[PDB]
């Protein structure tokens, strides 16, 4: 199916940002390096710098790949409850709050101490994680059993990205159940705008 | 009936922040102290830090104000549009954008170098900003001509403030017009759930 470098890169890559998901799991993202990371994945320094390019590049690199994995859990519950827009979107959001919170970088941004660059990533240059997780999300609405026309379905997903990105930094309050409001908020969007 | 010492501090606050709103016109929020403003605001050092106390006390403060200058042209343009939700919601939002962008503390967030302080406020530590401007905006839909069942005003509002904060924290990446698209998503909610 796919050539050597093509599948040998994506091995290296998922092999680091797996190592990172591992170092980060007992220690905190300020306490971790290219070097501490390289060591843990069993590569050189000079390789992570070529593949990612920096400690920054790894970081965002961590993020993007998380974004992907997160918008993809959606097709899960979309297939789960078919023909029912509320119960689909309920479980889709129930999940996304479950998952995003349990991630080591999330947890290490939230409870860990005052990271400038984690912060700079979720703000000043989010151009990548946002642009990307949008077009990736959009097809859950456009291609699948939830009819949505195309431009209506960018507008929707493009907003659902910017929300989740907010609820990641600033997590829903256990007083009231957020997944639900949000479901009830987009369903009225869903039905008007399908084909 | 404003118990004296009370309405005097309220007068006190707007005294300082109107100093900085004026200060950040010639400078950027990096070059401002307490004792940087307490001078052109016309008060003593010790006195100001007794009300706020941090640079990021008086910054967090300027923020809940701007939350409110901005959450309050809602009821205003919500009612200038009576009967048509999309025109209402739109024009309401268009102001919130061309306003937000005009404020000097935000022009500090944006073109100003690197404030890892500010980015703490609009994201992880945004918790009070959102939480206030949330119920503050709630009534606009409850007590106005969009007669919105009480819960659905927060289900609406908890959402419209998060999504707004996030053009401040994370600047629009492409040129598609965001007030437009934002109007678009909540309209079909309101049509069904208004009363
Ligand atoms: C540094 C932190 C990284 C955060 C990355 C977050 C990416 C957000 C993606 C949005 C996922 C949308 C899931 C909701 C699915 C549904 O409609 O039910
Ligand atoms: C530097 C920090 C600033 C923080 C700004 C917080 C903004 C909160 C926004 C609430 C305004 C909602 C606008 C509604 C308009 C409408 O529906 O017609």
Curated annotation (Swiss-Prot), chains A, B:
Report the DNA-binding ranges.
33-52
Give the activity regulation note: DNA-binding activity may be regulated by fatty acids.
Extract one GO cellular component term from the record: cytoplasm
Pfam families from the UniProt entry = TetR_C_35, TetR_N
Q: What happens when the gene is disrupted?
A: Disruption of the gene affects the expression of about forty genes. The mutant survives better than the wild-type strain inside macrophages. It also has impaired biofilm formation, due to overexpression of the alkB-rubAB operon. Mutant does not show significant difference in the transcription of mmpL3 and mmpL11.
Kindly list the places in or outside the cell where this protein is found, as annotated in its UniProt entry: Cytoplasm
Highest taxon of the lineage: Bacteria
Query: What are the BP-aspect GO terms?
Result: regulation of DNA-templated transcription
Q: Which UniProt keywords apply?
A: Cytoplasm, DNA-binding, Repressor, Transcription, Transcription regulation
Subcellular location, principal: cytoplasm
Query: Which Gene3D superfamilies does the record match to this protein?
Result: Tetracycline Repressor, domain 2
Ranges of residues in domain HTH tetR-type: 10-70
GO MF terms, alphabetically ordered: DNA-binding transcription factor activity; transcription cis-regulatory region binding
> What InterPro entries does the database record attribute to this sequence?
AlkX_C (IPR040611), Homeodomain-like_sf (IPR009057), HTH-type_TetR-like_transc_reg (IPR050109), HTH_TetR (IPR001647)
Fill in the subunit field for this protein: Homodimer.
Free-text comment on this protein's domains from its UniProt entry: Contains an N-terminal DNA-binding domain and a C-terminal ligand-binding regulatory domain. The C-terminal regulatory domain can bind saturated fatty acids.
Instruction: State the protein's purpose.
Output: Represses the expression of the alkB-rubAB operon, which encodes the alkane hydroxylase AlkB and the rubredoxins RubA and RubB. Acts by binding to the promoter region of the operon. In addition, EMSA analysis show that AlkX can bind to the promoter region of mmpS1 and mmpL3 and to the intragenic region of mmpL11, suggesting that it may participate in the regulatory network that controls the expression of MmpL lipid transporters.
PANTHER family referenced in this protein's UniProt entry, alphabetically: HTH-TYPE TRANSCRIPTIONAL REGULATOR BETI (PTHR30055:SF234), HTH-TYPE TRANSCRIPTIONAL REGULATOR RUTR (PTHR30055)
Q: What is this protein called?
A: HTH-type transcriptional regulator AlkX
| The encoding gene | alkX
